[PDB]
Structure 1
Amino acid sequence: KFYIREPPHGSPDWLKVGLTLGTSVFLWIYLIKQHKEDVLEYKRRNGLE
């Protein structure tokens, strides 16, 4: 074991873990939506379909 408090505890800091996971998910869905909007806009501007 450790005689010190071990600032990294036996369980992770769930606040920071949740913040990081939420940030990753938000960025991924934002990228997906942005790509969809961009391809739709390109198709509309070029008149392809």
Structure 2
Amino acid sequence: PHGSPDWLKVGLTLGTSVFLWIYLIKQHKEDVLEYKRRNGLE
């Protein structure tokens, strides 16, 4: 109807996306380090 961009939902969406990306990057880094330590690469 006659509505403004809901900044609450926009903020929640951006925060969720950024949090998911950051958590994924951290998980990938930990997985790489843990695999290297388990197989004794470096």
Summarize the Cα distance change of 1:29–1:21 in structure 2 as closer, same or farther, 3 Å threshold. Answer: same
Aligned CA RMSD, in angstroms, stands at 1.3
> In the TM superposition, what whole-angstrom CA distance separates every residue of 1:9-30 from its partner, at most 9, and x where no partner exists?
4531000000000000000000
Q: Report the structure number with the largest CA radius of gyration.
A: 1
Q: Count the aligned residue pairs.
A: 42
What's the % identity of the aligned pairs?
100
The TM-score, its normalising length taken from structure 1, stands at 0.79
Structure 2 residues without counterparts, runs of 5 or longer = none
| Greater RCO (CA < 8 Å, at least 6 residues apart) | 2
Change (3 A) 1:36 1:47: same
Structure 1: gaps (5+ residues)? 1-7
Runs of 4+ in 1 over 2 A off after TM superposition: 8-11
Distance 2:36 2:2 in 1: 52
Larger fraction in helix: 2
